[PDB]
Amino acid sequence: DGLAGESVEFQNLATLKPSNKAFEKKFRFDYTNERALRRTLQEDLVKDVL
Amino acid sequence: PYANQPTVRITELTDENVKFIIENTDLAVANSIRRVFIAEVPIIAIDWVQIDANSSVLHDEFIAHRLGLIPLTSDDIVDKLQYSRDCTCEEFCPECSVEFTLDVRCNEDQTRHVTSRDLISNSPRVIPVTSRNEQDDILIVKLRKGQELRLRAYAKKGFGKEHAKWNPTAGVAFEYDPDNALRHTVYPKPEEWPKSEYSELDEDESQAPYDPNGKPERFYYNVESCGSLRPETIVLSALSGLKKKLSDLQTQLSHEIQSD
Amino acid sequence: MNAPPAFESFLLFEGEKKITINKDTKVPNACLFTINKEDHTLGNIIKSQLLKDPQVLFAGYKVPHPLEHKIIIRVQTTPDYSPQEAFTNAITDLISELSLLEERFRVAIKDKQEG
Amino acid sequence: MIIPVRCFTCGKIVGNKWEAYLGLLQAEYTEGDALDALGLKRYCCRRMLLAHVDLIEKLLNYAPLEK
Amino acid sequence: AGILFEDIFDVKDIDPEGKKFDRVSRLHCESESFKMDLILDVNIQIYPVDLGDKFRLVIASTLYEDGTLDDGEYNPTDDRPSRADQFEYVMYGKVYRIEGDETSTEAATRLSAYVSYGGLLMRLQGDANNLHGFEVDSRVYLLMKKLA
Numbered sequence: 322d323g324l325a326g327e328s329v330e331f332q333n334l335a336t337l338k339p340s341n342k343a344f345e346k347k348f349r350f351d352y353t354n355e356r357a358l359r360r361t362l363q364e365d366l367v368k369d370v371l
Numbered sequence: 372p373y374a375n376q377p378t379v380r381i382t383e384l385t386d387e388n389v390k391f392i393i394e395n396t397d398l399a400v401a402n403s404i405r406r407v408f409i410a411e412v413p414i415i416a417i418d419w420v421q422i423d424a425n426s427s428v429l430h431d432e433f434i435a436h437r438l439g440l441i442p443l444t445s446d447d448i449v450d451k452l453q454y455s456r457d458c459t460c461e462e463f464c465p466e467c468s469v470e471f472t473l474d475v476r477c478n479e480d481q482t483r484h485v486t487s488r489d490l491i492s493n494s495p496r497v498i499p500v501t502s503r504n505e506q507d508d509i510l511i512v513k514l515r516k517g518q519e520l521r522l523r524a525y526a527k528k529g530f531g532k533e534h535a536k537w538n539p540t541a542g543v544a545f546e547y548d549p550d551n552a553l554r555h556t557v558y559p560k561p562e563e564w565p566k567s568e569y570s571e572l573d574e575d576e577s578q579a580p581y582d583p584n585g586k587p588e589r590f591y592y593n594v595e596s597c598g599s600l601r602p603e604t605i606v607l608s609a610l611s612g613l614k615k616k617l618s619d620l621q622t623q624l625s626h627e628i629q630s631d
Numbered sequence: 632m633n634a635p636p637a638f639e640s641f642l643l644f645e646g647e648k649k650i651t652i653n654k655d656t657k658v659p660n661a662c663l664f665t666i667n668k669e670d671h672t673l674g675n676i677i678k679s680q681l682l683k684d685p686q687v688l689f690a691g692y693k694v695p696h697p698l699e700h701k702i703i704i705r706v707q708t709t710p711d712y713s714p715q716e717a718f719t720n721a722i723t724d725l726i727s728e729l730s731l732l733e734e735r736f737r738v739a740i741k742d743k744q745e746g
Numbered sequence: 747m748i749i750p751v752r753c754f755t756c757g758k759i760v761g762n763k764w765e766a767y768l769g770l771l772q773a774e775y776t777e778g779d780a781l782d783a784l785g786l787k788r789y790c791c792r793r794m795l796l797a798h799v800d801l802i803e804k805l806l807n808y809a810p811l812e813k
Numbered sequence: 814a815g816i817l818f819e820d821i822f823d824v825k826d827i828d829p830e831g832k833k834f835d836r837v838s839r840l841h842c843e844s845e846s847f848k849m850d851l852i853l854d855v856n857i858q859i860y861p862v863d864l865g866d867k868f869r870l871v872i873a874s875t876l877y878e879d880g881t882l883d884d885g886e887y888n889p890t891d892d893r894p895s896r897a898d899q900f901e902y903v904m905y906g907k908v909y910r911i912e913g914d915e916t917s918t919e920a921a922t923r924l925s926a927y928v929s930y931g932g933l934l935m936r937l938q939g940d941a942n943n944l945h946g947f948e949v950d951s952r953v954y955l956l957m958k959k960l961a
């Protein structure tokens with residue numbers, strides 16, 4: 322990998338273990354639920370994404 | 372913003388010890404006083420030895436070590452003598468030292484004990500504590516028939532911070548908060564701990580109730596003397612010496628401030 | 632071999648200053664007092680008397696290394712006051728306390744010796 | 747070898763107490779009562795007398811080099 | 814006025830899991846008015862509290878009676894009027910968590926504000942309208958006084 326050993330650390334791969342349903346639920350951006358967008362993004366972003 | 376007004380109550384006073392209570396002072400002052408009793412009250416002790424003959428079984432540094440530990444009566448003379456650093460003489464003079472000689476030969480089939488009585492001084496107010504007019508004399512060495520010890524010594528002013536031979540105390544008892552009202556110590560099982568002699572608790576109570584407002588304000592001392600100084604002279608010398616250290620510091624501080 | 636002479640704990644070397652004052656630059660009204668050939672005996676009393684002064688905002692001391700023979704005292708004051716003035720006043724208060732304790736001990740001894 | 751002049755821990759003189767200690771163990775004091783008669787109230791001073799070994803008495807069995 | 818939350822609480826329990834620390838004890842309390850639930854670690858050595866004690870709790874953004882920010886630096890010589898003089902026990906801490914029952918599509922009806930007072934923890938939870946003054950990483954003062 323070309324890396325020095327002192328500068329690396331333990332991390333978890335978030336996509337390896339989840340089921341297909343949990344993977345989709347966690348990682349697929351839902352651009353269709355307007356109220357969830359309105360709770361997560363400011364208005365001009367919700368208008369653009371929709 | 373200002374000084375304490377401490378109070379003193381002497382509860383026992385003997386030739387060997389003084390027991391007293393200081394009240395309305397700070398713990399730091401009480402501890403620095405305790406420290407000065409040990410480290411910074413000056414007395415006279417043998418610090419230079421020359422051996423002319425030593426046929427004893429103990430080597431010369433052993434004899435000299437033992438002589439250095441013999442306590443010498445210091446009371447009014449040690450305030451008069453200079454330190455050898457401050458004195459103007461080339462090496463020794465009556466203004467900064469007391470001369471001693473010892474000369475013992477065993478000529479008998481009985482073992483000769485050589486003692487602090489065989490030390491002879493040139494100054495009649497600076498003598499070994501055991502030689503003052505009971506407690507026996509300090510044993511220096513034992514001589515077999517035909518063995519000899521002959522030496523000359525000078526005693527110098529010094530204080531226990533330089534060497535323990537100049538410590539005048541034989542133990543400093545110090546205590547505060549005898550019933551653990553301040554909880555500075557915390558006992559896991561208070562019922563196991565024996566009462567202080569200064570306790571005011573009844574025998575069914577292991578420690579006083581916690582005082583959230585108190586701080587150390589009463590201190591119990593037992594200052595025991597090795598005999599070179601009277602116990603009260605240990606205390607008064609310590610208070611004078613600590614006051615002098617502070618005055619010297621203020622003189623240097625005021626020069627430093629004027630230099631800035 | 633490398634034993635220091637025991638008097639080096641309390642005698643100044645030639646040209647050694649007893650006390651040096653430096654400004655603490657990182658906060659106002661603050662000084663470091665470096666005192667040579669002194670120990671906990673003076674540091675702890677000076678620090679504790681300074682904490683009795685309501686115009687002192689910080690007082691602390693350290694022995695930087697127990698084989699060295701110097702103490703650092705840090706003081707900070709309110710801006711109407713001075714850490715040099717606090718340190719001088721503290722020493723004056725201690726001297727007065729010890730003079731009063733000395734006189735009262737002489738009296739207690741005299742009373743104990745003759746009822 | 748010979749009794750220390752001072753208690754190592756507190757500086758009390760004990761170098762004048764050894765011959766008295768021996769002269770109390772003769773006359774059948776217990777070592778405790780002998781130490782208490784000598785005023786050795788702290789265990790650090792008692793340790794000095796109770797644990798001493800007077801080997802100088804053995805060293806004095808050898809004749810000196812010079813008469 | 815800088816006050817974030819004020820209510821009167823009744824001590825319903827003390828150290829229910831047992832005594833975890835000797836000088837600190839965990840109160841469990843309920844509001845009378847706003848029906849808040851309070852968990853609070855208290856230095857009971859200096860300020861002892863008994864089961865069924867009633868006390869007034871103020872959480873404030875500043876001790877000054879006038880609106881004025883706190884630099885968080887200990888000045889004991891500050892002589893400005895301070896609400897601490899109306900109270901018996903005062904702590905200083907920061908908000909480290911705000912949990913709630915919010916969903917993807919709905920705002921929270923209930924909130925849970927967590928504060929650390931140098932490691933003495935507090936959780937105040939109840940209807941969200943009472944807790945809108947709390948913001949994470951804000952410094953806050955707890956002021957507490959027993960009621961007869």
Ligand SMILES: [Zn+2]
Pocket residue numbers: 455458459460462463464465466467468
């Ligand atoms: Zn001289």
Ligand SMILES: [Zn+2]
Pocket residue numbers: 753754755756757758788789790791792
């Ligand atoms: Zn001892």
